[PDB]
Ligand binder design. Structure first.
Ligand SMILES: O=C(NC1CCN(S(=O)(=O)C[C@H]2CC[C@H](NCCCC(F)(F)F)CC2)CC1)c1cc(C2CC2)on1
Ligand SMILES: Nc1ncnc2c1ncn2[C@@H]1O[C@H](CSCC[C@H](N)C(=O)O)[C@@H](O)[C@H]1O
Ligand SMILES: [Mg+2]
Ligand SMILES: [Mg+2]
Ligand SMILES: [Zn+2]
Ligand SMILES: [Zn+2]
Ligand SMILES: [Zn+2]
Length: 426
């Protein structure tokens, strides 16, 4: 018995609404992807199948592009990799855009696979394309993706009889652009891109009543507020650390809509997000383009070097509540954790705690993860009362956003028991 149902909204296309009253933390839907792939930066760093990082990965011998954590993952991935393998090998050394590799997997799944549970409420065929809202520049970009797909897939798909009935590649890429999900690992690093057509029914809010979280490729949809019968379910499509102007640009560019929510009408939190000297944070925002690229490719030493030059600059500095400063602290923290620089990681992480309380109101999985990271760093440094407070706060958030079905909650329970045993021996 589903707790959610598809419906036709008055002015947002189709949507999802509650069939029963919902409480924070309630699991509403869970889904594997219709199709997914590792993303550009994480290719060869994480396993193609389970999206977990490993010090050494085994490569597919035929294409040498797909890489796996284990013989189990390589073999289990073979049915969904078999046809793309010949295309990837034929295209070497050229690697396709993520969207092109993704749509290849969509096509093979729809041609060769049984009907997917991911499409229970809504299918790839049903997805919004927004084609009549596309500007000419966007249509041109989609045409180039179509031609890139035809080149990449030529070994496996030569004509329309090898595509699903009435399949239009331009329309398919339009759907991919507006309906791709960024798959994040347990630490909230972007590691993949996938299509989850039933989850695509969720419309956007900058102050949503639901949240999604990834456990490998698996997606969990949970309520994060009380929700009444008939009430529309929403998620936030975007990073919370964005001004209303930034959200406006991305929602127009990628999703072809103008957001009418209260936060956008009132520029909610914009002024607090942009405190400090504008010339300074404009420079930091510029530097973050490279920092974000380095982080996406797991280049932690390079990330840390650039972040330290900002955090410890000889020149003017920013308040930690400035969102570009905050992003630099976040990246520096994550780099230090991955490099084993645990004292420095804790310094940066502790500084983010109050800004995160302000910018992630309610129960948000990203703040849950951040607080867990800080609590774990404090546990390792022997600060048991401080660690316990943060681990308990992380649990209060993550019991709602992640839940028992997410493996990170089991990890958190072990940290809480270890911290508690230390306190009791003191
Ligand atoms: O992919 C979808 N949403 C995303 C929203 C964002 N999250 S997140 O949980 O906040 C994790 C993010 C936290 C920030 C992190 N970036 C930090 C970079 C900072 C810099 F630049 F300084 F380096 C990246 C991960 C993931 C899911 C989606 C699609 C749809 C379709 C339209 C239906 O809905 N939702
Ligand atoms: N808050 C919002 N206001 C207006 N349109 C929205 C919206 N959130 C999502 N959408 C629409 O939904 C698309 C994302 S997919 C969400 C389901 C979609 N409404 C459908 O009918 O299939 C966006 O590109 C936009 O067309
Ligand atoms: Mg349509
Ligand atoms: Mg329309
Ligand atoms: Zn694996
Ligand atoms: Zn291969
Ligand atoms: Zn809004």
């Amino acid at each position: 018995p589903l707790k959610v149902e598809k419906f036709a909204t008055a002015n947002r296309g189709n949507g999802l609404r509650a069939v029963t009253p919902l409480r924070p933390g309630e699991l509403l839907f869970r889904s594997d992807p219709l199709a997914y792939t590792v993303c550009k930066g994480s290719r060869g760093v994480v396993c193609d199948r389970c999206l977990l990082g490993k010090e050494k990965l085994m490569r597919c011998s035929q294409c040498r592009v797909a890489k796996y954590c284990s013989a189990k993952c390589q073999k289990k991935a073979w049915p969904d990799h078999k046809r793309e393998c010949k295309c990837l090998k034929s295209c070497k050394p050229r690697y396709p855009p993520d969207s092109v590799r993704l749509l290849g997997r969509v096509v093979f799944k729809l041609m060769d696979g049984a009907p997917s549970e991911s499409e229970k409420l809504y299918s790839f065929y049903d997805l919004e394309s927004n084609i009549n809202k596309l500007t000419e520049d966007k249509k041109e970009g989609l045409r180039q993706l179509v031609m890139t797909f035809q080149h990449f897939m030529r070994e496996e798909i030569q004509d329309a009889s090898q595509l699903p009935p009435a399949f239009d590649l331009f329309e398919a890429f339009a759907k991919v652009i507006c309906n791709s999900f960024t798959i994040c690992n347990a630490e909230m690093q972007e590691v993949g891109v996938g299509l989850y057509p039933s989850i695509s029914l969720l419309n956007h809010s900058c102050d949503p009543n639901c949240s999604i979280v990834f456990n490998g490729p698996h997606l969990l949809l949970r309520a994060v507020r009380d929700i009444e019968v008939g009430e529309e379910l929403t998620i936030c499509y975007l990073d919370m650390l964005m001004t209303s102007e930034e959200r406006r640009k991305q929602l127009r560019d990628q999703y072809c809509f103008e957001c009418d929510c209260f936060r956008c009408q009132t520029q909610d939190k914009d002024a607090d997000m942009l405190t400090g000297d504008e010339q300074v944070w404009k420079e930091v925002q510029e530097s973050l383009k490279k920092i974000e690229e380095l982080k996406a490719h797991w280049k932690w030493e390079q990330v840390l070097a650039m972040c330290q030059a900002i955090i410890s600059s000889n020149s003017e500095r920013l308040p930690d509540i400035n969102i570009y400063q905050l992003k630099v602290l976040d990246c520096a923290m994550d780099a230090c954790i991955n490099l084993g620089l645990l004292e420095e990681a804790l310094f940066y992480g502790t500084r983010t705690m109050e800004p995160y309380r302000i910018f992630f109101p309610g129960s948000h999985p990203v703040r849950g993860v951040q607080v867990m990271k800080v609590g774990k760093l404090q546990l390792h440094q022997g600060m048991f009362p401080q660690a316990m407070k943060n681990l308990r706060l992380a649990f209060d958030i993550m019991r709602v956003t992640h839940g028992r079905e997410h493996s990170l909650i089991e990890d958190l329970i072990l940290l809480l028991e270890e911290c508690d045993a230390n306190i009791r021996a003191s």
